[PDB]
Structure formats: C-alpha cells, structure tokens
Enzyme design. Structure first.
Site, PDB file in Angstrom:
ATOM      1  N   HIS A  40       0.823  -1.219   0.000  1.00  0.00           N
ATOM      2  CA  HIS A  40       0.000   0.000   0.000  1.00  0.00           C
ATOM      3  C   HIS A  40       0.856   1.268   0.000  1.00  0.00           C
ATOM      4  CE1 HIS A  40       0.289  -0.460   4.459  1.00  0.00           C
ATOM      5  NE2 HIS A  40       0.343   0.857   4.409  1.00  0.00           N
ATOM      6  N   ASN A  54      17.442  11.822  12.243  1.00  0.00           N
ATOM      7  CA  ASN A  54      16.555  12.971  12.178  1.00  0.00           C
ATOM      8  C   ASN A  54      16.238  13.137  10.693  1.00  0.00           C
ATOM      9  OD1 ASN A  54      15.438  15.575  11.845  1.00  0.00           O
ATOM     10  ND2 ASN A  54      16.629  16.415  13.552  1.00  0.00           N
ATOM     11  N   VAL A  57      16.817  16.897   9.059  1.00  0.00           N
ATOM     12  CA  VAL A  57      18.052  17.623   8.798  1.00  0.00           C
ATOM     13  C   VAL A  57      19.131  16.669   8.328  1.00  0.00           C
ATOM     14  CG1 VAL A  57      17.425  18.921  10.899  1.00  0.00           C
ATOM     15  CG2 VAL A  57      19.595  17.671  10.829  1.00  0.00           C
ATOM     16  N   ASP A  84       0.242  -7.895   1.523  1.00  0.00           N
ATOM     17  CA  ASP A  84       0.713  -6.516   1.590  1.00  0.00           C
ATOM     18  C   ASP A  84       2.222  -6.478   1.707  1.00  0.00           C
ATOM     19  OD1 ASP A  84       0.633  -3.749   1.702  1.00  0.00           O
ATOM     20  OD2 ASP A  84      -0.273  -3.629   3.705  1.00  0.00           O
ATOM     21  N   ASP A 169       1.659   1.251  20.056  1.00  0.00           N
ATOM     22  CA  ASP A 169       1.280   0.728  18.732  1.00  0.00           C
ATOM     23  C   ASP A 169       1.994   1.460  17.569  1.00  0.00           C
ATOM     24  OD1 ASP A 169      -0.157  -0.897  17.004  1.00  0.00           O
ATOM     25  OD2 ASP A 169      -2.073   0.117  17.222  1.00  0.00           O
ATOM     26  N   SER A 170       1.757   1.012  16.336  1.00  0.00           N
ATOM     27  CA  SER A 170       2.309   1.673  15.157  1.00  0.00           C
ATOM     28  C   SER A 170       1.266   2.718  14.812  1.00  0.00           C
ATOM     29  CB  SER A 170       2.468   0.705  13.981  1.00  0.00           C
ATOM     30  OG  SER A 170       3.461  -0.268  14.246  1.00  0.00           O
ATOM     31  N   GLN A 172       0.180   6.205  11.763  1.00  0.00           N
ATOM     32  CA  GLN A 172       0.347   6.809  10.434  1.00  0.00           C
ATOM     33  C   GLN A 172       1.780   7.219  10.188  1.00  0.00           C
ATOM     34  OE1 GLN A 172      -3.568   6.011  10.175  1.00  0.00           O
ATOM     35  NE2 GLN A 172      -2.379   6.856   8.471  1.00  0.00           N
ATOM     36  N   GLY A 173       2.371   6.686   9.119  1.00  0.00           N
ATOM     37  CA  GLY A 173       3.760   6.995   8.804  1.00  0.00           C
ATOM     38  C   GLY A 173       4.725   5.856   9.104  1.00  0.00           C
ATOM     39  N   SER A 175       3.874   2.517   8.288  1.00  0.00           N
ATOM     40  CA  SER A 175       3.650   1.484   7.277  1.00  0.00           C
ATOM     41  C   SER A 175       4.930   1.099   6.541  1.00  0.00           C
ATOM     42  CB  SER A 175       2.646   1.959   6.242  1.00  0.00           C
ATOM     43  OG  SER A 175       1.318   1.608   6.573  1.00  0.00           O
TER      44      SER A 175
HETATM   45 CA   LIG Z   1      18.836  13.219   8.259  1.00  0.00          CA
END
Ligand SMILES: [Ca+2]
Lengths: 221, 56
Positions: A40, A54, A57, A84, A169-170, A172-173, A175
C-alpha cells in the site's frame, strides 16, 4: 510509533525512509540493492533514504537513492489487504550506520518479543511526527486473539502484535517498517484500528511466508 | 454526493498527503491518507479535486 522510545542514532541500521517529497512510509534494507516494504506504500518517484535518524536535517550519514523498480506482490489485494508486501530495487547499491536485516529461517511464535521502528505519528489522539526514529518492543500475539480482535479480516499472511491494554502501537507513517524478532525480519507494519486503541492490536504482514518469493524475485530482477 | 463526505484516512498506516473537497470552506484541502481503502473524496492534486467537486 505511539508509546515507544527514541532508538538512538543509527541503532536500527536496516530502517529506511521512503520519501516522495516527504516521508510517507518506512521499509527494511534486506541487501545492498533491495528494500522490503508494504504494497500500500506503492508510489511513483520514490526516493529511499538510508542512514537516517533525524529525517528533517542532513547529518552526514545519509544516502538518498532513487528506486529503479517497485515490485508489489502479484496477489496483493487492496480490498482485503492480503499479501501486503513490496520490493523496491535501488537504482544503485547502498554503501553498507547502514546495514541489512536477515530474512527469517522460520516463523515466530506467539509471545515472541519484537522491535518495531518508524517515524510515524506518536500521538494516539492527536498528531505529532518525530524528527528522530522511534522504537517499540511488542510481543507477537496468537492467531486466535488476533482473529478475535478483527473478525473475518485476518488471513494466514498476517499476525497481530502489541498490547491489548492499548497505548503502544504503530501509527500513520510507520507502514512498511520492520518488525524484527531475534535478529530476523518477521513482519512489515501494515494496518490497525486507529492507533494504540485498547483491544485493537496492530496487524503486520507475516514475512516468513514470503521468503521464497522474495529470494527468487530479488535474483531475477 | 461524495464531495460532501468528510476525508477518510482508512486503516493502513502510511502518511500520504491527498486532497479532499471541504464543502464548508468551498475549497480543496489536504489530509493524511493511510494508503488503502480510499473513498471518492480523495484526490492526488488540487486541480483534480476542483475539477471533480469544485462548487459542490
Ligand atoms: Ca537526516
């Protein structure tokens, strides 16, 4: 990752960020030229970012490499979310902070503790995307309880992991990210019911069932 | 009228930015789509959104 902790710079070397102008999914480096993620998360113009901590940056340890190919499992069902899984071939090989994760020799059993990582939302009721990578230890749950949490939605290719109490939990972002148990890649962050709700553990793609397809697909592409 | 429907993130955990027509504001706005089970008020660009739902 809701309720997790900051992993630490490059402590999860196989974690990658899928970027399409912004971070939209995670993935795992299984070899110098291949990444595994969720179907997905299929998108055109994917740039894979390795050696990231990070994501906002540039800190030097990064390697941005465009995807040459994106192979979504031939039987992926967008309605049922079954199969999936997707493989992304890097345009050029990554220089192995950056390391690959091993595929599983066998399936993991309920109770197994695993490490889930990602740059997803950290708030269950709200929104907060982190700069640095977040980590979470969560146990694999039995097929029975997983099926109890999601009536007629769990297939043989999915497993639940997490806590019935909720709060970890996991989200949004996350996946496409890794679920590593005993040093082997056992799952791919896939779907859930909101985030950290509860009696609603997260659902993951059972990687052990795809090892043959993965190995043959990598070799003939 | 699907253009009047609120944005639907869905069960999947991707963070994909899409557009939806916000009938209250009279414009197309962005929202986070999870990657699966999209409803019709979900567009890849504001132009697509305006073309389909504009003025609903
Ligand atoms: Ca970086």
């Amino acid at each position: 990752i809701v309720g997790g902790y900051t992993c630490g710079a490059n402590t999860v070397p196989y974690q990658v960020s899928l970027n399409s102008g912004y971070h939209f999914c995670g993935g795992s480096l299984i070899n110098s030229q291949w990444v595994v993620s969720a179907a997905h998360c299929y998108k055109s113009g994917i740039q894979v970012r390795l050696g990231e901590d990070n994501i906002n940056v540039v800190e030097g340890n990064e390697q941005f490499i465009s995807a040459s190919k994106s192979i979504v499992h031939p039987s992926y069902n967008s309605n049922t979310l079954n199969n999936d899984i997707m493989l992304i071939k890097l345009k050029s090989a990554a220089s192995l902070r950056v390391a690959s994760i091993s595929l599983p020799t066998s399936c993991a059993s309920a109770g197994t503790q695993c490490l889930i990582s990602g740059w997803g939302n950290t708030k269950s009721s709200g929104t907060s995307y982190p700069d640095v990578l977040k980590c979470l230890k969560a146990p694999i749950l039995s097929d029975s309880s997983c099926k109890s949490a999601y009536p007629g939605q769990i297939t043989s290719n999915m497993f639940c992991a997490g806590y019935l109490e909720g709060g970890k939990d996991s989200c949004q972002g996350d996946s496409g990210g890794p679920v590593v148990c005993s040093g082997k890649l056992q799952g791919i962050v896939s779907w859930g019911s909101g985030c950290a709700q509860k009696n609603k553990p997260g659902v993951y793609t059972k990687v052990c069932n795809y090892v043959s397809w993965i190995k043959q697909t990598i070799a003939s592409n | 009228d699907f253009c009047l429907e609120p944005p639907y993130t869905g069960p999947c955990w991707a963070r994909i930015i899409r557009y939806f027509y916000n009938a209250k504001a009279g414009l197309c706005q962005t929202f986070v789509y999870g990657g699966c089970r999209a409803k019709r008020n979900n567009f890849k660009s504001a132009e697509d959104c305006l073309r389909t739902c504009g003025g609903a």
